[PDB]
Amino acid sequence: EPNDFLVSVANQIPQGKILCLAEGEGRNACFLASLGYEVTAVDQSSVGLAKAKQLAQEKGVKITTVQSNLADFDIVADAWEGIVSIFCHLPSSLRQQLYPKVYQGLKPGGVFILEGFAPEQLQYNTGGPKDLDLLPKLETLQSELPSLNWLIANNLERNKAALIQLLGQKLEH
Template structure:
């Protein structure tokens, strides 16, 4: 099953699988982006994060996801909210070869296989402007013991070294494994073990 087929199956159901509210960690660090203009959201699915930041700020926003169904939901909701500052691209992130620079790159719960992270994280770091931020929340490998969501495949889960051992041209502001309570639609509900990341390009 391709990434598009997998996520289209999840997003084809009525409503928003992970709800309409942005991820709480991304929201909590909105203040870091006060001088930012161009934002990129990776693995953005149905668009809850991109729409929140588009509604509350004057950002130029791009969103990439493998699911055309998820992005159609994003576009339809943006249209209903009269937002015209979100550009979407349907693409498997393994095929992402960025040509633009961004002031911030964000994602929540992007399930990238561990063998593919070198390329992804290099692309992220290379695509950030000087002093730009990479902000993310992902499931820790310890999430395997929780039933609040996420894959049951350790190769799709993360540990702190995934971030500590990469991003050599950046400052690791925060890389922290934490226990949190998730309330994100039907997809993420309950106690979870996550890794929260804030990295700033030097």
């Protein structure tokens, strides 16, 4: 059961290396790997990364390059066709550090996909962080990756959850 938004925009990611931020599970990574991508699942819990490998072995995908945490993590510039952040919530101070490396890590034409709780999610009891610092508005996230071409930018509310969905593509030279 991979993320529905991710399965909906998978066709927008050029074949190549895809990096999943704090993907823990392995359902999104294995889902993408089943499409022909070279995925690197990065998570902090060795218990999750270990279960990610097992799911890969069962789903028949030789793609699950595990990793560590995100705090002191850096990605090689122009090396990824896609970088996915599904419900990967971080404090403003950390997004200010990460996102710039995310923008630079993306090859021209590569995409950045995000799905997470909107600030109004605080009015619901269906999950997500309580600190508004980890719940930036859709426009604030966009300003953290300004040079990207936003193919999709949705603010959704159902009542139940408040979500933001983004698909940003790095321009061609």
